[PDB]
Design a binder for these strands. Structure first.
Ligand SMILES: [Mg+2]
Length: 210
DNA sequence: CCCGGACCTGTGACAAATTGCCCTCAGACGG
DNA sequence: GGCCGTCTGAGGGCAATTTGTCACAGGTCCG
């Protein structure tokens, strides 16, 4: 299945995209990299890749696409929009999109790589972003270890504001995304909390390959 | 000594959002 | 050439789960 690669600058960028948007984003990077910024998506190809019907695919593409308008990307700073023109459909089952051409160099650069079958069953988008940031440190054999700062997690994954109270952070973000990865990917993940006084400051992740 | 206050934790409620499903009907194409 | 049956996909919806928010009880330490 397709091998995604992207600059580490994209893995660690600050942005908020949905699952459907992130899925499409994987195909743009694949299309662009296999070569002006104009990409294309076929309904019937999307449906076969992610095991959806044509009807629900059409809905996913359509609603994801109109929700890109106004979205921005921050590299740590400098902010850019994803699209510089609305999408449009010349043919039935076919959509044409205009990626901000200034984003091209950020896609292809110190890089991150994973096969698309590894992430395509994940549902929660924060769990996608986390799996991407563990892959950035993975070793050939499939293991690694990394410490991420909690304030840095919140800015980069653009977690919603109420998750600045740590018990909500634990309950609705951390536990679920550790759970999904262990249930939906070929990776076995564990973690431990680093404290300073009463405050929890970092999260320390360990993983291997099954 | 014990207090209110400033921190921290987990859980129960409710509100807001998303998931995979279902149903209709016209477009595009090949037979 | 030209009509129709079939495969697509662009819409309209649902209930069951997931995600996002906050009140409230109960731990610590300090002045
Ligand atoms: Mg869908």
């Amino acid at each position: 299945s397709p091998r995604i690669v992207q600059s580490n600058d994209l893995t660690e960028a600050a942005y908020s995209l949905s699952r459907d948007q992130k899925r499409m984003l994987y195909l743009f990077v694949d299309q662009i990299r296999k070569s002006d910024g104009i990409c294309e998506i076929h309904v019937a190809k999307y449906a076969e890749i992610f095991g959806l019907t044509s009807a629900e695919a059409s809905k996913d593409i359509r609603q994801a696409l109109k929700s890109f308008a106004g979205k921005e990307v921050v590299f740590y700073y400098e902010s850019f929009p994803w699209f510089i023109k609305p999408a449009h459909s010349p043919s039935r089952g076919l959509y044409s999109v205009h990626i901000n051409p200034y984003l091209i160099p950020f896609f292809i650069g110190r890089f991150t790589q994973f096969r698309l079958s590894e992430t395509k069953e994940i549902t929660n988008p924060y769990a996608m972003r986390l799996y991407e940031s563990l892959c950035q440190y993975r070793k050939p054999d499939g293991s690694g270890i990394v410490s991420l700062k909690i304030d840095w997690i919140i800015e980069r994954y653009q977690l919603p504001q109420s998750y600045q109270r740590m018990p909500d952070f634990r309950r609705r973000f951390l536990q679920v995304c550790v759970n999904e990865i262990n249930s939906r990917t070929p990776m076995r993940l564990s973690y431990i909390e680093k404290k300073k006084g009463r405050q929890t400051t970092h999260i320390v992740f360990s993983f291997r390959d099954i």
